[PDB]
Amino acid sequence: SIVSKTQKQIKELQSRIEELEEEVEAERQARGKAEKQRADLARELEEL
Amino acid sequence: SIVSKTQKQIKELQSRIEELEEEVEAERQARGKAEKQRADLARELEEL
């Protein structure tokens, strides 16, 4: 019974790793968007 | 013996899940400071 209930734990904790991964590439794409959002806005500053 | 290995496995897989949450906060403060940087430069754009 100890084996049964912690196998459920290594089910979900390995499940959290594969779902915590999906916001690693997603909030990389935020930093892809955010740094590129300022870059044009930095560019319009200096030409002004 | 196999519940001992999962006892090793539940902590060494936990050793990665601490690192992956350590990264997801880092992109959070990065994207957090980025939206505050562009909100800062949005002010003096009109001033200039």
Put simply, the chain A residues between 9 and 38 with a CB less than 8 A from any chain B CB are 9-10, 13-14, 16-17, 20-21, 23-24, 27-28, 30-31, 34-35, 37-38
Q: Which residues on B lie below 8 Å from A6 (Cβ)?
A: 3, 6-7, 10
Resolution (A): 4.2
Residue B10 and residue A14: Cβ atoms within 8 Å?
Answer: no
Q: How far apart are the C-alpha atoms of B40 and B4, rounded to whole Å?
A: 54
C-alpha A25/C-alpha A43 separation (Å) is 27
A41-44 LR contacts (CB < 8 Å, sep 24+):
A41/B38, A41/B41, A41/B42, A41/B45, A42/B41, A44/B45
* Method used to obtain the model: cryo-EM
- Tell me chain B's radius of gyration from C-alpha atoms: 21
Looking at the complex, report in whole angstroms how far the Cα of residue B3 sits from the nearest Cα belonging to chain A. Answer: 6
Contact B9, A13 (CB under 8 A): no
